[PDB]
Design a protein around this ligand. Structure first.
Ligand SMILES: C[C@](NC(=O)CN1CCN(C2CC2)C1=O)(C(=O)Nc1cncc2ccccc12)c1ccc(Cl)c(Cl)c1
Lengths: 300, 296
């Protein structure tokens, strides 16, 4: 029993964190086999952050300009290349702690663990979700760039995020490990604003099923709804549309609890209409949207 | 910016998790140097233990079986002496924590780490964890520089879904026993110093709506705290909040008057750090550590 926001054990990722220094900038790198991955903005100076030409800046760099540090050992850079917004520093030593890994690009609503680092040293691990507006609501200070988001299924690390920047609202933007930004963001100091965020509806439903599995039933009702009527209501509360894919994904939780997805959708509509009335669901006074259907099944 | 419930990096603890099997029971063990620590309920515990032999305990570190060469009991923890010292043994200490103190839990099943989360030792000595069957022997810890302080070992789930366990010397937190009997968690209270630390974290993050021009005496605040099932705030707590008070410019008794107004009037549809409830599972140290980026 119990339901916590749970992160994956970070050990397999800790053994990959290195510090990358180029000129005055110091950030984190991910050392896998003989390559160190980090945000390409590590090559940027002061007057070339509004409109940096990364190809022009990288061509002027040599391997010895990049100082890579793994613990108290300095690694030797023997090559450098750029793949989208990520810089790949070829090093002369393969990381012996390299776990079984994959690079996966995730969709909005997906959750992952973040290992927050500073100067190549892990300082904390927390759980995140990719927001529908493609930002992540993280906890990062200056120096956290290069910190990564990941999931661990079986003994394999799926790296899904690399931190690149903080938007003016305090939310965070980054890329997958192939350097492709999540969302319409760019690694430029140009005026960028996160779009209006919405609640991840399928995740709220999964969390309502977790509450039912844990014995909380007060919010349930005798109503059901059509998928379209639910979406017309949910949209008015800035909730993401619920698709047939989402209804299908909730199938196992519906089968386990005996509550049809559209029946739980009608409980959700009622919660949106009434609020919680001084009650909590799984210790929360707000509807939680950072647990996916897969997280709920895994934790329960 | 941002404020998350953040656990310590679990790597140093993952390298210590082993699976202990004795008869039909399988749970987790903590392998440090040449000793495996686990709940004694894996086996009148002195009468039960005397009947066991080393070969009855199957210890597994990954796909390698460890051989037990001795066994002894220290309070509610069983200590299995093994032939091999754990090469991954970090710098560590066994520390007993106080209610209100926070720690990270590495939840394990069959000696395999599956999740990490941050929680607080409640004033009623339970932890509001997330554990299923097989999680016994999962440990709670903090990291100081490169030293792991082990503070908790999971033993059981109480009928309300809350958890109970011991320090690494086998002493329970709370008035609990490791036996099948009627046990109930006492009425819980809110960790007042932690709520204040979290209100300072909200101020550091730009959430200032709850601030007011008022201050209060420590006695008037404690009279209100008692009324709302909040733990008494001591001069020690006020002193610990000193750095956060200095950084934000809000005296502790000034933040107390904000807390008092929140308790008597509610949040009024408004939220603090994305929460509609007052969070009490961040200590003053946790807030400083997260709003300053201390590394391990
Ligand atoms: C590296 C970063 N540089 C800055 O923003 C630093 N700077 C720049 C403006 N300003 C001046 C000193 C007062 C700063 O503070 C960044 O946003 N990283 C940070 C990451 N996570 C959390 C942060 C929390 C506070 C601060 C910075 C954070 C950055 C900036 C613009 C771009 Cl286009 C990109 Cl790709 C990256």
């Amino acid at each position: 029993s119990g339901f916590r926001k749970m992160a994956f054990p970070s050990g397999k990722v800790e053994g990959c964190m290195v510090q990358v220094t180029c000129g005055t900038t110091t950030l984190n790198g991910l050392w896998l086999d003989d390559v160190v991955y980090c945000p390409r903005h590590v090559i940027c100076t002061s007057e070339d952050m509004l409109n940096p030409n990364y190809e022009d800046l990288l061509i002027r760099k040599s391997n010895h300009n990049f100082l890579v540090q793994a613990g108290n050992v300095q690694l030797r850079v023997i090559g450098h290349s750029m793949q989208n917004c990520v810089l790949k520093l070829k090093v002369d030593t393969a990381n012996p702690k390299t776990p079984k890994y994959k690079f996966v690009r995730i969709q909005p609503g997906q959750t992952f663990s973040v290992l927050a680092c500073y100067n190549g040293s892990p300082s904390g691990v927390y759980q995140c979700a990719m927001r529908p507006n493609f930002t992540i609501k993280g906890s990062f200070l200056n120096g956290s760039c290069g910190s990564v988001g990941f999931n661990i299924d079986y003994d394999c690390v799926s790296f899904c995020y690399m931190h690149h920047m903080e938007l003016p609202t305090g939310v965070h933007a980054g890329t997958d490990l192939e350097g492709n930004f999540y969302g319409p963001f760019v690694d430029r100091q140009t005026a960028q604003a996160a779009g209006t965020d919405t609640t991840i509806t399928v995740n709220v439903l999964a969390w309502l099923y977790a509450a039912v599995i844990n014995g909380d039933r007060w919010f349930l009702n005798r109503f059901t709804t059509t998928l379209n009527d639910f979406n017309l209501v949910a949209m008015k509360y800035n909730y993401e549309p619920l698709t047939q894919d989402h209804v299908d994904i909730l199938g196992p939780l519906s089968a386990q609890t005996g509550i049809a997805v559209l029946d739980m959708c009608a409980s959700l509509k009622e919660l949106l209409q009434n609020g919680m009335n001084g009650r909590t669901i799984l210790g929360s006074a707000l509807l939680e949207d950072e647990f996916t259907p897969f997280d709920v099944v895994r934790q329960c």
